[PDB]
Symmetry: C3
Subunit: 257 residues, 3 copies
């Protein structure tokens, strides 16, 4: 049910309930009318942690375009002790500032899902071996590229670029000299995009990188002279990191020859 | 005139009129400040109908960034009887929910323009032959790709891809072997983009598809060895479906040879 | 500190201060939740001047996503008399419309920074020689392409396209016939993009043009047979015009041979 705005013209004794309802309706209406890139309903715009789990930057969109922002006023840590899911808890509370009451949102971390909270959504997956807490991939859309898992992806992509250069130099150029120029062209394009993306994390998206890698993969398959059936992977806005990892692994497997 | 926010500091007897005016001003200000992709003022984000005209999904932005959403609470049909324009009517009405009055927007369908309504904008064009109601192209910007007319476009594009493959295999490769590799590359790129777009309708735009088709067209014209004058068509954000149809028709005409 | 919404449930004598605070908090919350392309915090969406400095169109986002709009109700001129910085001043004032008080934002132009104003941000740089006021490049992000400085950039880009065609026709094609096809392809792509961008200014961004020019530059460097070290320039969302000018100048310098 889409309620538009509240109806004031009737006239009634101004109580707190009607004002709170009006504010809530206005907020809901304007949040619904808002737009996100690629018409997404939720995503992560920034999420970084210290490398005990300590949160430095947290900014994301929950389901139905709910905005969550983390103030640096209080620490956000869990400090586990001994497949470990990580959950985010949002509880509202009343605080007073310079003589005026307000409504605040308090963030917390828990090991499992909890009740009695406004929101409880899993945001990360962690696996520990001898107390190391190796990060793990979790399926969630992200809008920007400044995610804590992107370091491993960048290292793997640099290794893939080096492997691609070696593969083109050694055997691919000798067999098919015609497509070698286009392959070098696309490799340089990917390298330039990676160099730009590493320096600027908040102004990039995974779709461009996935498109470049997929294009490089398809170009090799077309002239590979192997079986005519080519395996195609489609990008998914729900699991982008998984698709990037699978594409990189397949590219490395084909490049190792 | 850009009114920013209302001025409360004067102090006055709190009547319903001032509260309604404040809410309206806040809504107008925040709607004006909003942003849409490619800096558009209106567009269609989702519009699907059953295949009597029955509406299943309706979501679009009117002029001056006005947001219209269709609740599935009530049916939305016209049921014509015997170039048939279709119009959308918006009338506001007062409803009460759990003891609180609200303002609701009611949607309706009419054969022609009507007065006495908040909005009356034509959204579709229909032509019937022996009571069939064949869909017709209407000029209106759309943000996503889930429009009811995209099925015919997808079928035509698949046929165009097959025709392009046949044309490249038969005559184009034999005459110009140099550009054949690039042509096959671009054809595969278009095929991959089409495969992704068909599965994911809400996360795609017509501009990418138009760019790919136009690029394929230009590549053929450059090495076609025919008259040096090449006909170039520019994408228009006001009539995207028309441009797509014209480009596809021209590509098919050139491919039939 | 992220204050969410105001707390009304306590109940208190309804004064103007609490209503103004509630409106301000709602506006701040919804402005913070808003999103801009490439996750930018500020930018210019439209800025045109008559060619005394007379402002015709002014629309931009200030820092922290503050929206500024210029009404055509009053003139906006400076009329200097004799490195001249230009500043924008925003002062709020109370106006009354049809019996209802409101809050208005008044825009002004000044030679230097001023105090006692809500905002004072430099937006343009001008240099005069014998009273001519030649426009100068200032570093500021812009979202669309309808900026007053784009005319010179478009002229330089057309000259660059002509120079690139001449360079490819004369010497580059004779030495390396393999990459000539790809170079002509990319030149035609850039020409088509420029033709589209000139007609449609409000629906384009500098990133696409920069990517096309950089791609053309890299393709030439790869097969240039000169020193293997290639100079790469990265696009910056903070100084896009500067990067475009530097890339165009370097391309012209390399093309002159």
């Amino acid at each position: 049910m889409f309620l538009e705005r509240i109806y004031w013209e009737d006239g009634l004794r101004l109580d707190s309930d009607i004002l709170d309802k009006s504010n809530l309706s206005v907020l809901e209406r304007l949040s619904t009318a808002s737009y996100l890139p690629a018409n997404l309903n939720k995503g992560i715009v920034s999420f970084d942690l210290d490398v005990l789990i300590l949160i430095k930057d947290l900014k994301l969109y929950l389901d139905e375009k709910n905005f969550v922002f983390y103030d640096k006023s209080y620490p956000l840590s869990l400090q586990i002790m001994t497949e470990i899911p990580l959950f985010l808890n949002i509880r509202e509370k009343v605080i007073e500032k310079n003589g005026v009451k307000y409504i605040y949102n308090q963030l917390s971390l828990s090991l499992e899902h909890s009740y009695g909270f406004k929101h409880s959504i899993q945001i990360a997956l962690f696996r520990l071996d001898r107390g190391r807490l190796v990060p793990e991939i979790y399926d969630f859309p992200l809008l920007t590229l400044n995610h804590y898992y992107l370091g491993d992806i960048f290292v793997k992509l640099n290794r893939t670029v080096s492997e691609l250069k070696s593969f083109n130099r050694f055997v691919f150029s000798a067999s098919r000299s015609y497509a070698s120029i286009l392959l070098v062209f696309l490799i340089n394009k990917l390298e330039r995009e990676l160099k730009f993306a590493e320096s600027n994390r908040a102004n990039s998206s995974p779709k461009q990188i996935f498109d470049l890698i997929d294009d490089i993969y398809s170009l090799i398959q077309l002239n590979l002279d192997k079986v005519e059936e080519l395996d195609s992977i489609e990008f998914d806005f729900q699991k982008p990191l998984t698709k990037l990892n699978l594409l990189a692994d397949r590219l490395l497997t084909l490049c190792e020859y």
